[PDB]
Design a binder for this molecule. Structure first.
Ligand SMILES: Cc1cc2nc3c(=O)[nH]c(=O)nc-3n(C[C@H](O)[C@H](O)[C@H](O)COP(=O)(O)O)c2cc1C
Length: 169
């Protein structure tokens, strides 16, 4: 399999659009996209580097497909793997639950052995609370296509450059 496995869930396609851009930034040959509606938890075993994408929905909840796989994460050993996270959200409409989903996923995957890389600054965002906070930084890249779609491309560019360094790729 390719070097990096990017597993994402999506309802209206924004998380998928972001996933495609992330793939392009790394290079089409480095990343393989996996929509978790079609994935099995065991597919995560095929990669030494993982990128987890998920929108926060219905006020602080995981996207449905990730919700389903979450329950089976206990069946996977992430030890030895480096994992990064990106989330889509709306900081204005859900200021108290901005990017909660990636925080929820990282908490579980880290417990299962996955080492987190890709922490992201909170500068440039206006929100009140988030389960994705770790020492003042988001556990991963935060995109907001509802209010800051004009910032997404450059944010991904910067984040991918960071991940190449942290992944050692
Ligand atoms: C009913 C509903 C609830 C939402 N709840 C949250 C939330 O709690 N936190 C957040 O950051 N974004 C929230 N959002 C915003 C979505 O995460 C955002 O629009 C995202 O880009 C959608 O991605 P998708 O197109 O991949 O589904 C919500 C959107 C809808 C329509």
């Amino acid at each position: 399999a390719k070097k990096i496995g990017l597993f994402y869930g999506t309802q209206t396609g924004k998380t998928e659009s972001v996933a495609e851009i992330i793939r392009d930034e790394f290079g089409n040959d480095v990343v393989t996209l996996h929509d978790v509606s079609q994935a099995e938890v065991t597919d995560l075993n095929d990669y030494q580097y993982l990128i987890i994408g998920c929108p926060t929905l219905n006020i602080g909840e995981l996207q449905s497909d990730w919700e389903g796989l979450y329950s089976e994460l206990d069946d996977v050993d992430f030890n030895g793997k480096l994992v990064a996270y990106f989330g889509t959200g709306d900081q204005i409409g859900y200021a108290d639950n901005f990017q909660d989903a990636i925080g929820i996923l990282e908490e579980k995957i880290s417990q299962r052995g996955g080492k987190t890389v890709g922490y992201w600054s909170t500068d440039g965002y206006d929100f009140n609370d988030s389960k994705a906070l770790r020492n003042g930084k988001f556990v991963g890249l935060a995109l907001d296509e509802d209010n800051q779609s004009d910032l997404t491309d450059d944010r991904i560019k910067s984040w991918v450059a960071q991940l190449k360094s942290e992944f050692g790729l």
